Protein backbone atom coordinates (compact mmCIF):
# COMPACT_ATOMS: atom_id res chain seq x y z
CA UNK A 1 0.00 0.00 0.00
CA UNK A 2 1.69 3.20 -1.22
CA UNK A 3 -0.77 5.96 -0.28
CA UNK A 4 -4.34 6.26 0.99
CA UNK A 5 -7.11 8.65 -0.04
CA UNK A 6 -10.89 8.92 -0.27
CA UNK A 7 -13.30 9.35 -3.18
CA UNK A 8 -15.21 12.53 -3.96
CA UNK A 9 -18.99 12.44 -4.32
CA UNK A 10 -21.92 11.25 -2.27
CA UNK A 11 -21.52 8.17 -0.08
CA UNK A 12 -24.05 5.68 -1.47
CA UNK A 13 -24.05 3.64 1.76
CA UNK A 14 -23.48 5.91 4.77
CA UNK A 15 -21.75 4.91 7.97
CA UNK A 16 -24.27 3.39 10.42
CA UNK A 17 -25.28 5.69 13.26
CA UNK A 18 -24.28 3.06 15.86
CA UNK A 19 -20.64 3.34 14.77
CA UNK A 20 -20.04 7.13 14.96
CA UNK A 21 -20.83 9.77 17.57
CA UNK A 22 -22.15 12.74 15.60
CA UNK A 23 -20.51 16.14 15.92
CA UNK A 24 -19.46 18.79 16.02
CA UNK A 25 -20.57 22.36 16.05
CA UNK A 26 -18.65 22.50 12.79
CA UNK A 27 -18.03 19.28 10.79
CA UNK A 28 -21.51 17.72 11.23
CA UNK A 29 -21.20 16.39 7.67
CA UNK A 30 -19.53 12.99 7.78
CA UNK A 31 -16.46 12.91 5.55
CA UNK A 32 -16.15 10.61 2.57
CA UNK A 33 -15.82 7.05 3.88
CA UNK A 34 -14.87 5.44 0.55
CA UNK A 35 -11.21 4.51 1.03
CA UNK A 36 -8.86 3.15 -1.65
CA UNK A 37 -5.10 2.62 -1.57
CA UNK A 38 -2.61 3.06 -4.37
CA UNK A 39 -0.61 -0.11 -5.10
CA UNK A 40 3.11 -0.36 -5.74
CA UNK A 41 5.07 -3.20 -7.31
CA UNK A 42 8.08 -2.51 -5.06
CA UNK A 43 11.46 -3.85 -6.20
CA UNK A 44 11.93 -5.77 -9.46
CA UNK A 45 15.03 -7.96 -9.59
CA UNK A 46 16.68 -10.57 -11.78
CA UNK A 47 16.55 -13.13 -8.95
CA UNK A 48 12.73 -12.91 -9.06
CA UNK A 49 12.57 -13.54 -12.82
CA UNK A 50 10.50 -16.48 -14.08
CA UNK A 51 11.63 -16.19 -17.71
CA UNK A 52 14.86 -16.65 -19.70
CA UNK A 53 15.14 -20.12 -18.11
CA UNK A 54 13.80 -23.43 -19.45
CA UNK A 55 10.88 -25.38 -18.01
CA UNK A 56 10.53 -29.13 -18.56
CA UNK A 57 7.01 -30.57 -18.25
CA UNK A 58 7.99 -33.66 -16.27
CA UNK A 59 4.51 -34.25 -14.85
CA UNK A 60 1.25 -32.41 -15.49
CA UNK A 61 -1.23 -31.51 -12.77
CA UNK A 62 -4.19 -32.53 -14.94
CA UNK A 63 -4.83 -35.70 -16.90
CA UNK A 64 -3.62 -34.10 -20.15
CA UNK A 65 0.13 -34.67 -19.73
CA UNK A 66 1.17 -32.07 -22.28
CA UNK A 67 -0.64 -33.45 -25.33
CA UNK A 68 -1.31 -30.66 -27.85
CA UNK A 69 -4.68 -31.72 -29.19
CA UNK A 70 -5.57 -30.13 -32.51
CA UNK A 71 -1.87 -29.44 -33.19
CA UNK A 72 -2.08 -26.14 -31.31
CA UNK A 73 -0.68 -24.75 -28.06
CA UNK A 74 -1.83 -21.80 -25.95
CA UNK A 75 0.94 -20.04 -24.01
CA UNK A 76 -0.17 -17.21 -21.72
CA UNK A 77 2.41 -14.77 -20.33
CA UNK A 78 2.13 -11.77 -18.01
CA UNK A 79 5.32 -9.81 -17.28
CA UNK A 80 5.16 -6.47 -15.44
CA UNK A 81 8.90 -6.46 -14.66
CA UNK A 82 9.62 -4.84 -18.05
CA UNK A 83 6.83 -2.26 -18.09
CA UNK A 84 9.05 0.83 -18.44
CA UNK A 85 7.28 3.42 -20.61
CA UNK A 86 9.65 5.40 -22.82
CA UNK A 87 9.03 9.13 -23.27
CA UNK A 88 9.64 10.68 -26.69
CA UNK A 89 9.94 14.43 -27.29
CA UNK A 90 9.67 15.92 -30.78
CA UNK A 91 10.35 19.58 -31.53
CA UNK A 92 7.82 21.51 -33.60
CA UNK A 93 10.03 24.62 -33.60
CA UNK A 94 13.19 25.90 -31.89
CA UNK A 95 12.64 29.33 -30.33
CA UNK A 96 15.56 31.51 -29.25
CA UNK A 97 14.83 30.55 -25.62
CA UNK A 98 13.25 27.44 -24.13
CA UNK A 99 9.47 27.39 -24.61
CA UNK A 100 7.21 24.44 -23.79
CA UNK A 101 5.06 25.21 -26.85
CA UNK A 102 7.94 24.05 -29.08
CA UNK A 103 7.81 20.38 -28.05
CA UNK A 104 5.34 17.49 -28.15
CA UNK A 105 5.59 14.67 -25.60
CA UNK A 106 4.66 11.09 -26.49
CA UNK A 107 4.28 7.80 -24.62
CA UNK A 108 5.71 4.59 -26.07
CA UNK A 109 6.07 1.06 -24.70
CA UNK A 110 7.73 -2.02 -26.20
CA UNK A 111 7.64 -5.78 -25.62
CA UNK A 112 10.20 -8.29 -26.90
CA UNK A 113 9.56 -12.04 -26.84
CA UNK A 114 11.28 -15.20 -28.06
CA UNK A 115 9.20 -18.37 -27.69
CA UNK A 116 11.20 -21.61 -27.76
CA UNK A 117 9.57 -25.04 -27.67
CA UNK A 118 10.66 -28.68 -27.75
CA UNK A 119 8.01 -31.27 -28.65
CA UNK A 120 7.92 -35.07 -28.53
CA UNK A 121 6.21 -37.10 -31.24
CA UNK A 122 3.55 -39.52 -29.98
CA UNK A 123 1.32 -42.15 -31.55
CA UNK A 124 -2.14 -43.36 -30.51
Amino acid sequence: ARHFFNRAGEVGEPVPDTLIIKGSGNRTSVGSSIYVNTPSGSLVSSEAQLFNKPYWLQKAQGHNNGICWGNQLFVTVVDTTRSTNMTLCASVTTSSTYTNSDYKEYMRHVEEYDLQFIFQLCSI
Partner: antibody, heavy 120, light 108 residues
Amino acid sequence: EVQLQQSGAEVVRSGASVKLSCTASGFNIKDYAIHWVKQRPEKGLEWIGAIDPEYGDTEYVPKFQGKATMTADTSSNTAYLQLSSLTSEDTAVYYCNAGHDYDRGRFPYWGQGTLVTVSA
Amino acid sequence: DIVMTQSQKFMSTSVGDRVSITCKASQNVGTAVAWYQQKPGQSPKLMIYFASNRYTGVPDRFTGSGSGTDFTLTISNMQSEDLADYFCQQYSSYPLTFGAGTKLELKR
Protein backbone atom coordinates in the same frame (compact mmCIF):
# COMPACT_ATOMS: atom_id res chain seq x y z
CA GLU B 1 0.12 25.76 -45.73
CA VAL B 2 -1.66 26.58 -42.45
CA GLN B 3 -4.44 29.03 -43.29
CA LEU B 4 -8.02 29.20 -42.00
CA GLN B 5 -10.96 29.77 -44.35
CA GLN B 6 -14.23 31.12 -42.97
CA SER B 7 -17.84 31.34 -44.14
CA GLY B 8 -17.94 34.75 -45.83
CA ALA B 9 -19.58 38.13 -45.32
CA GLU B 10 -23.33 38.19 -44.68
CA VAL B 11 -25.96 40.93 -44.47
CA VAL B 12 -28.63 40.09 -41.88
CA ARG B 13 -31.69 41.96 -40.69
CA SER B 14 -32.06 42.63 -36.98
CA GLY B 15 -33.54 39.80 -34.94
CA ALA B 16 -32.18 36.90 -37.01
CA SER B 17 -29.39 34.43 -36.29
CA VAL B 18 -26.19 33.94 -38.29
CA LYS B 19 -23.75 31.01 -38.29
CA LEU B 20 -20.04 31.44 -39.02
CA SER B 21 -17.74 28.56 -39.92
CA CYS B 22 -14.01 27.88 -39.81
CA THR B 23 -11.82 25.30 -41.56
CA ALA B 24 -8.62 23.27 -41.10
CA SER B 25 -8.57 23.81 -37.31
CA GLY B 26 -9.99 20.91 -35.33
CA PHE B 27 -8.85 17.39 -36.21
CA ASN B 28 -8.90 14.04 -34.47
CA ILE B 29 -5.95 13.46 -32.10
CA LYS B 30 -4.91 17.06 -32.84
CA ASP B 31 -5.70 18.95 -30.45
CA TYR B 32 -5.82 22.71 -31.05
CA ALA B 33 -7.36 25.38 -28.83
CA ILE B 34 -9.61 27.44 -31.12
CA HIS B 35 -10.47 31.03 -30.17
CA TRP B 36 -12.82 33.59 -31.69
CA VAL B 37 -12.18 37.35 -31.69
CA LYS B 38 -14.62 40.16 -32.47
CA GLN B 39 -13.35 43.41 -34.02
CA ARG B 40 -15.63 46.45 -33.61
CA PRO B 41 -14.43 49.70 -35.27
CA GLU B 42 -14.79 51.37 -31.83
CA LYS B 43 -13.88 48.74 -29.22
CA GLY B 44 -10.84 47.22 -30.95
CA LEU B 45 -10.46 43.49 -30.31
CA GLU B 46 -12.72 41.48 -27.99
CA TRP B 47 -12.18 37.82 -27.10
CA ILE B 48 -15.28 35.66 -27.46
CA GLY B 49 -14.45 32.15 -26.26
CA ALA B 50 -12.08 29.19 -26.39
CA ILE B 51 -13.14 25.80 -27.80
CA ASP B 52 -11.01 22.65 -27.90
CA PRO B 53 -11.63 20.06 -30.63
CA GLU B 54 -11.05 16.42 -29.64
CA TYR B 55 -12.86 17.34 -26.38
CA GLY B 56 -15.47 19.94 -27.23
CA ASP B 57 -14.67 21.93 -24.12
CA THR B 58 -16.24 25.37 -24.05
CA GLU B 59 -15.35 28.62 -22.32
CA TYR B 60 -17.09 31.93 -22.91
CA VAL B 61 -17.06 35.57 -21.82
CA PRO B 62 -19.86 36.73 -19.48
CA LYS B 63 -20.50 39.54 -21.98
CA PHE B 64 -21.19 37.07 -24.81
CA GLN B 65 -22.86 34.25 -22.85
CA GLY B 66 -26.32 33.87 -24.33
CA LYS B 67 -25.25 35.86 -27.41
CA ALA B 68 -22.62 33.56 -28.95
CA THR B 69 -22.99 29.78 -29.22
CA MET B 70 -19.98 27.62 -30.10
CA THR B 71 -19.95 24.17 -31.70
CA ALA B 72 -17.23 21.86 -33.02
CA ASP B 73 -17.48 18.98 -35.51
CA THR B 74 -14.69 16.48 -34.83
CA SER B 75 -14.71 15.08 -38.38
CA SER B 76 -13.23 17.52 -40.92
CA ASN B 77 -13.97 20.73 -40.04
CA THR B 78 -14.55 23.14 -37.13
CA ALA B 79 -15.31 25.76 -35.80
CA TYR B 80 -18.89 27.01 -35.95
CA LEU B 81 -19.78 30.27 -34.17
CA GLN B 82 -23.42 31.39 -34.23
CA LEU B 83 -25.02 34.55 -32.83
CA SER B 84 -28.69 34.75 -31.87
CA SER B 85 -30.61 38.03 -31.56
CA LEU B 86 -28.44 40.22 -33.77
CA THR B 87 -28.38 43.95 -32.99
CA SER B 88 -26.48 46.97 -34.28
CA GLU B 89 -23.64 46.31 -31.81
CA ASP B 90 -22.85 42.97 -33.49
CA THR B 91 -21.78 44.58 -36.80
CA ALA B 92 -18.13 43.54 -36.71
CA VAL B 93 -15.43 41.38 -38.28
CA TYR B 94 -15.05 37.98 -36.61
CA TYR B 95 -11.85 35.93 -36.69
CA CYS B 96 -11.21 32.24 -36.08
CA ASN B 97 -7.78 31.88 -34.47
CA ALA B 98 -5.84 28.79 -33.39
CA GLY B 99 -2.62 28.89 -31.44
CA HIS B 100 -0.53 25.98 -32.62
CA ASP B 101 -1.75 22.82 -30.83
CA TYR B 102 -2.92 24.48 -27.59
CA ASP B 103 -2.91 27.51 -25.26
CA ARG B 104 -4.62 30.91 -25.13
CA GLY B 105 -2.23 33.80 -25.70
CA ARG B 106 -0.89 32.49 -28.97
CA PHE B 107 -2.84 33.41 -32.10
CA PRO B 108 -0.23 32.87 -34.84
CA TYR B 109 -2.81 31.40 -37.24
CA TRP B 110 -5.70 33.78 -37.94
CA GLY B 111 -8.72 33.30 -40.14
CA GLN B 112 -9.38 35.40 -43.21
CA GLY B 113 -11.99 37.45 -41.36
CA THR B 114 -15.78 37.52 -41.76
CA LEU B 115 -17.63 40.83 -41.88
CA VAL B 116 -21.15 40.62 -40.43
CA THR B 117 -23.49 43.58 -40.93
CA VAL B 118 -26.67 43.62 -38.85
CA SER B 119 -28.94 46.34 -40.23
CA ALA B 120 -32.13 46.84 -42.18
CA ASP C 1 -11.47 41.72 -15.91
CA ILE C 2 -7.84 42.73 -16.41
CA VAL C 3 -7.73 46.05 -18.26
CA MET C 4 -5.01 46.54 -20.89
CA THR C 5 -4.14 50.24 -21.10
CA GLN C 6 -1.80 51.36 -23.88
CA SER C 7 -0.22 54.81 -23.50
CA GLN C 8 -0.84 56.57 -26.82
CA LYS C 9 -3.32 55.86 -29.61
CA PHE C 10 -0.93 57.26 -32.24
CA MET C 11 2.87 57.32 -32.32
CA SER C 12 5.33 59.38 -34.35
CA THR C 13 8.81 58.32 -35.47
CA SER C 14 11.03 58.31 -38.55
CA VAL C 15 12.67 55.64 -40.68
CA GLY C 16 15.60 54.02 -38.89
CA ASP C 17 14.71 55.30 -35.41
CA ARG C 18 13.81 53.33 -32.28
CA VAL C 19 10.22 53.07 -31.04
CA SER C 20 8.90 51.77 -27.72
CA ILE C 21 5.21 50.98 -27.14
CA THR C 22 4.03 50.56 -23.55
CA CYS C 23 1.26 48.33 -22.21
CA LYS C 24 0.10 48.66 -18.60
CA ALA C 25 -1.85 45.91 -16.84
CA SER C 26 -4.44 46.45 -14.12
CA GLN C 27 -3.21 43.26 -12.39
CA ASN C 28 -0.07 41.16 -12.10
CA VAL C 29 0.02 38.80 -15.08
CA GLY C 30 3.62 37.65 -14.76
CA THR C 31 4.83 37.24 -18.34
CA ALA C 32 1.52 36.10 -19.89
CA VAL C 33 1.48 38.94 -22.42
CA ALA C 34 1.48 38.69 -26.21
CA TRP C 35 1.92 41.32 -28.92
CA TYR C 36 0.28 41.41 -32.35
CA GLN C 37 0.68 43.40 -35.57
CA GLN C 38 -2.31 44.27 -37.77
CA LYS C 39 -2.08 46.04 -41.12
CA PRO C 40 -5.12 47.72 -42.70
CA GLY C 41 -7.39 45.30 -44.52
CA GLN C 42 -5.58 42.26 -43.13
CA SER C 43 -5.83 39.90 -40.18
CA PRO C 44 -3.50 40.38 -37.20
CA LYS C 45 -0.18 38.53 -37.18
CA LEU C 46 1.44 37.26 -34.00
CA MET C 47 4.75 38.96 -33.17
CA ILE C 48 5.78 38.29 -29.54
CA TYR C 49 4.28 35.86 -27.04
CA PHE C 50 5.28 35.11 -23.44
CA ALA C 51 6.41 38.75 -22.99
CA SER C 52 9.78 38.47 -24.75
CA ASN C 53 9.75 35.45 -27.13
CA ARG C 54 9.60 36.06 -30.88
CA TYR C 55 7.35 33.82 -32.94
CA THR C 56 8.67 31.85 -35.91
CA GLY C 57 8.78 34.50 -38.57
CA VAL C 58 9.46 37.69 -36.66
CA PRO C 59 12.84 39.40 -37.18
CA ASP C 60 15.25 40.18 -34.37
CA ARG C 61 14.29 43.81 -35.08
CA PHE C 62 11.34 43.38 -32.70
CA THR C 63 12.05 42.84 -29.00
CA GLY C 64 9.58 42.42 -26.16
CA SER C 65 10.21 43.11 -22.49
CA GLY C 66 8.50 43.63 -19.15
CA SER C 67 6.86 41.54 -16.45
CA GLY C 68 4.07 41.80 -13.91
CA THR C 69 2.19 44.92 -14.98
CA ASP C 70 4.47 47.00 -17.27
CA PHE C 71 5.26 45.61 -20.72
CA THR C 72 7.03 47.19 -23.69
CA LEU C 73 7.56 46.45 -27.39
CA THR C 74 10.71 47.94 -28.94
CA ILE C 75 11.49 48.29 -32.67
CA SER C 76 15.27 48.82 -33.02
CA ASN C 77 15.64 50.52 -36.44
CA MET C 78 12.56 50.68 -38.63
CA GLN C 79 11.36 49.87 -42.12
CA SER C 80 8.38 51.10 -44.11
CA GLU C 81 6.73 47.67 -43.70
CA ASP C 82 6.41 48.22 -39.92
CA LEU C 83 3.58 50.77 -40.28
CA ALA C 84 0.56 49.05 -38.72
CA ASP C 85 -1.41 48.70 -35.50
CA TYR C 86 0.13 47.01 -32.46
CA PHE C 87 -1.91 45.29 -29.75
CA CYS C 88 -0.98 43.75 -26.41
CA GLN C 89 -2.95 40.84 -24.97
CA GLN C 90 -3.31 39.36 -21.48
CA TYR C 91 -3.81 35.62 -21.00
CA SER C 92 -3.19 35.17 -17.28
CA SER C 93 -6.88 34.61 -16.49
CA TYR C 94 -10.22 34.64 -18.26
CA PRO C 95 -11.62 36.62 -19.87
CA LEU C 96 -8.82 37.44 -22.32
CA THR C 97 -8.45 41.18 -22.95
CA PHE C 98 -6.62 43.35 -25.47
CA GLY C 99 -5.27 46.88 -25.39
CA ALA C 100 -6.41 49.90 -27.35
CA GLY C 101 -5.10 50.48 -30.85
CA THR C 102 -1.71 52.09 -31.45
CA LYS C 103 -0.95 53.54 -34.89
CA LEU C 104 2.70 53.96 -35.89
CA GLU C 105 3.35 56.73 -38.42
CA LEU C 106 6.57 57.85 -40.10
CA LYS C 107 8.11 61.33 -39.86
CA ARG C 108 9.68 61.03 -43.36
